[PDB]
Amino acid sequence: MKEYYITARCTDKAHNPNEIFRSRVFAPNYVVAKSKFWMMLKKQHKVKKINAELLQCQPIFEKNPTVVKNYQIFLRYVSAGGIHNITKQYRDVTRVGAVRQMYNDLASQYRTRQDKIQLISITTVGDKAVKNPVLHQFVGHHVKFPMVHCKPVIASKRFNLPIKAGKLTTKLC
Amino acid sequence: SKDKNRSSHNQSHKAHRNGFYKPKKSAYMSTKGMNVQVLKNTKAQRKFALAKKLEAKKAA
Amino acid sequence: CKARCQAFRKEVILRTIKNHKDIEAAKKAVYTAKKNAEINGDLYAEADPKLIVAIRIRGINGVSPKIKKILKLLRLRQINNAVFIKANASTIKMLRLVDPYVTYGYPTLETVQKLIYKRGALKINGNRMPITSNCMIKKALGDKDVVCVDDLVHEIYTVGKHFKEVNNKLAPFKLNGAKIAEKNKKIHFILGGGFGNRELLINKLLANMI
Amino acid sequence: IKPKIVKKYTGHFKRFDSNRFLRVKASWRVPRGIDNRLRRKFKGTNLLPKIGYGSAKATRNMLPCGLYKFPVRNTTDLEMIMMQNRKYAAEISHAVSAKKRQEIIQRAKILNIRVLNADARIKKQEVAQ
Amino acid sequence: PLSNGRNRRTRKLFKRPFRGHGLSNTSTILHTYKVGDYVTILCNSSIQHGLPYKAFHGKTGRVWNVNPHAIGVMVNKKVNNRIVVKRLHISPEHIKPSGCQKDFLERKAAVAAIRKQNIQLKKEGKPLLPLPAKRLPKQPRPAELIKGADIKFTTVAPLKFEELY
Amino acid sequence: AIDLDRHHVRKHVSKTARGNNAYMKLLVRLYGFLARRTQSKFAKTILHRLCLSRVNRPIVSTSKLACLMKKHPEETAVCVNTVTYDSRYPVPKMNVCALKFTKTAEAAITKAGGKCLRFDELALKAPTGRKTVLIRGKRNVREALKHFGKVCAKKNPAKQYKGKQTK
RNA sequence: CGAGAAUAGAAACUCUUGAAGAAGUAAAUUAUCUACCCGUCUUGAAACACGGACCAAGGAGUCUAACAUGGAUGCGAAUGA
RNA sequence: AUAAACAUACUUUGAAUCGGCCAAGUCUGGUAAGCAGGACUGGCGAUGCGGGAUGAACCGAACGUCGAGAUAAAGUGCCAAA
RNA sequence: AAAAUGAAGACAUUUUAACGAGUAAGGAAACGAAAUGGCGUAAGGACAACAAAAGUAGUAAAGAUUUAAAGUAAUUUAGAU
């Protein structure tokens, strides 16, 4: 999952060649980003690739991929019944990192595959605007929990024997 | 004992094996059933040019 | 006797300098133009690609009669076969029709060089002979002003005036096998599949295939 | 000097169903049946003679000793391979008597020609001799 | 299952154009056809006499003979696995001047104009003009600069789903 | 596999003298060597015609040689076939190289003052072909060509193989 | 630093096994993988469709007459007799 | 624009065959049918190989005898290679 | 398929390149660069020790049973009884 900045213009009778269409598209690569970008133009402004020129398709990186932020993804997906608008909150350090979480959450809770979800916008909310019941318990400064029933950690697959000698124990960790 | 009446299945594939034989150029140059006066003009001139050419060959 | 071998060798050296000068000067001009647009706050639209490399992905069984003819006109008659295709409004539509059976994109100069040097061949007297000498290239393409392999590469990459005659001489490269897709080759590359337009990502697939 | 004689299949191509029925001999016959298991090349039974099994042309029809075979019926037959003693080998015919076999054998040693039946139709010099 | 009538399945093929009934044009009978021209067979149902077969409707043919009231037309017909030459005699009420070579004919005029100048320049010493460039498919567009003084930006994002009820 | 238009089958061109004629096999060898080395279209043409079948090597009469060389007096007609004699018209003086001369044809050419050369003589005198006129006989004058087709045809009917009660 | 070019530069070796049986090949057995009854009509048979208990010998596009095409042959306005 | 010289155009003689069946981002009769009949294409028939446990048609891919390598559909707890 | 060579080598010549699934069906003989290549049964006409005693055979024929070798195969070859 990567984020791209794509611009283009339409040069034909219908559209003046002075209107630039910008976008911020989350795509696995840059070929998919243009594919998403063109369909947005075709379904909204009747602009087709045969009558348009791309200008700049540059990757966008996180300025501070070390600061924890609370996100708020506004999205619309298609179900068996109809189309719905949903808002989901996520905690991550990168914009692209949170989007992959949204895709994995949507595909599990709602069983909605990737070719039904359209991301309208993604912003950053404060520490009190989180409304997810599970995620609201981890925004405070005084949060602590004893991680228990830990499986003992193996340093690497090198020491992973199939049969072990002696009893096996879990960890208060 | 009913049978299947007709099918075009595998008929375009059969037709394109030895493909559409185009007519030769000699087919487009036929002049049967043309204008009677136009035909008379052509025959009259072709007899005039032929006689003149054959006379010169005869002299030498 | 063979004093012309040194003379022929020098002409290859002189022409190679001219070829590299043309490619580097054109590449430099793009970089300078891009900077001035950034300085002036303008917008720069990169020129559309001219050369397309296409690879046959699917087999030969179960192809529509119209799709079967296009793959013959592009000389993609075998699975794992690569050809170079001129990009225009004619061949772009032709490739879209045969999309499920091909993957294509825009190759880099390094990709073009390695394809010709390692897998290149020519059709001489109806024989698919691999490239082994510049005399074999001078004989085949003498009248087209192509005497060295680096002249063969330069014409292909820049799409010169004699591209069609030069490109037709080259036999379609027979590539190896490589991981075609992430999901499978039954969907478009946009969906994670194998076929379709890969744009500049065809070089990664070609690297594992050459 | 002798090259490596390489055979692509050292077994025998046995007729189909020859093992089950005795009226069916082991000499190969291509199955023409419309439902034959072998001729449709089923897994397990797809062993048929093909031109691809042919051995190398350089080392074809060559005996393990490194030479070809040239049958002889008399001493004068040996005179046709005296120039090629390094390429051919004499093979006395199966009907040549014991008296004539010695004359061929003696002359072959004189002409330096190998004989593949050098110990054939010999007398009783194995017991009491 | 259809019948083998001559004019079967002509409820829509042989119908006149909407508000196109009555008499035809006058230029239809005044157009001068010459041998070698390209014509289009268009069966006019308003004239039942000499109506061509319904299979040749819309076919483009070449004039091969001119007769006092009929114009000879020669079109190609497709048979089992071959192609045959069909020769017809059609009144002008059923044919039409084809425009297939309209683009080709103007290119000949453009070349003939340039060539006529090249005979006015070579003898007089001036450099001779070249022939017009050949047609090519839409080529890849070249690089160009876009000014940032008269430009404007409009953002594009997926639209929030709005119900139509 | 590979998707081809067709598979390679033997090309339908003969490259040797058909039959076991020891002399026609020698002419093919003689002109196969001439065409390969001299690389002249004439020797290639003669080599190609020497390998045609008998039905494709039609005869040329002395009447046709006379008319073809009327404006070519210092020439040598070359026809790869039997040369027959037309008993209705005179034979002028001319040198003819041919595979075979009919007894009445050779006498007519010799008596008129001409020369009857074989093909090994021509290769000795004009190998590449210098004073030669290439001549071949008519192929469509065969009686078999009349019956080829369907006689019911409206344009070019066949000629109706005769048989029981043919009226 | 140095491409072209001119002058000088160079590779002939070890150890093990074998007429006390080497390398390869064959037969028998064992082990892993693999293998439905042949012929036939049929869209489709391993078929709950038919013939087949086993073996030997016999066993089925031949001859005469007319026509045509085609490949080799002789002669040629003649050819055959 | 692209492809095409073992290209292209054929000529003559003639074999077998016209019981077909299947799939479907197709249709008509029928409640429906592994039912009956059609338009376009691809297949089985005539076809083995790898996968779906087993399967005429599905997926990959069509076959001279082999050695080595990346691969396809698809799989990676054991049967079962991962 | 194309180039090279070619009175006789030999393996049905040398080199290069592409190709090689298959029911019904077709590819008669001959054709030096050969217009598919061959195995087997019987009978007829010739050839088979070139110095005037000229293929094998009571110093063991044909047949039969097996052991091995050559050929992709049809089959051939030799040993022992």
How would you portray this structure in words?
- This is part of a larger assembly, with chains A (173 residues), B (60 residues), C (210 residues), D (129 residues), E (165 residues) and F (167 residues).
- Chain A is built from two helices and six strands.
- With 173 residues, chain A is an alpha+beta fold.
- Chain A has a three-stranded antiparallel β-sheet, sandwiched between helices. A three-stranded antiparallel β-sheet of chain A has the order 5-4-6.
- The two termini of chain A are 33 Å apart.
- Chain C has 210 residues and is of the alpha+beta class.
- Chain C has eight helices and eight strands.
- In chain C, the strands form two sheets. Chain C has a five-stranded mixed β-sheet.
- The termini of chain C are far apart.
- Chain F contains five helices and five strands.
- In chain F, strands 1, 2, 3, 4 and 5 form a five-stranded parallel β-sheet that branches.
- The chains are: A alpha+beta (173), B mainly alpha (60), C alpha+beta (210), D little secondary structure (129), E alpha+beta (165), F alpha/beta (167).
- At the A-E interface, strand 2, helix 1, strand 5 and strand 6 of A face strand 7 of E.
- Chain F: InterPro entries: Ribosomal_eL18 (IPR000039), Ribosomal_uL15/eL18 (IPR021131), Ribosomal_uL15/eL18_sf (IPR036227).
- Chain F: Residues 2-163 form the Large ribosomal subunit protein uL15/eL18 domain.
- Chain F: One of its GO terms (cellular component) is cytosolic large ribosomal subunit.
Summarize the structure.
This is part of a larger assembly, with chains A (173 residues), B (60 residues), C (210 residues), D (129 residues), E (165 residues) and F (167 residues). Chain A is an alpha+beta fold.
Helices and strands of chain B, in order, run as HHH
What series of H and E elements makes up the topology of chain C?
Answer: HEEHEHEHEEHHHEEH
Give the strand content of chain C. Answer: 15-25%
Strand coverage percent of chain B: under 5%
Shape of chain B: elongated
The end-to-end distance of chain C, rounded to whole angstroms, is 40 Å
The total strand number of chain C stands at: 8
Total beta-strand segments of chain B: 0
Question: Class by helix and strand content of chain B?
Answer: mainly alpha
> Which sheet architecture does the biggest sheet of chain B show?
none
Helix content of chain C: 40-55%
Protein name (chain D): 60S ribosomal protein L32, putative
InterPro entries (chain D): Ribosomal_eL32, Ribosomal_eL32_sf
Keywords (chain D): Ribonucleoprotein, Ribosomal protein
Family (chain D): Belongs to the eukaryotic ribosomal protein eL32 family.
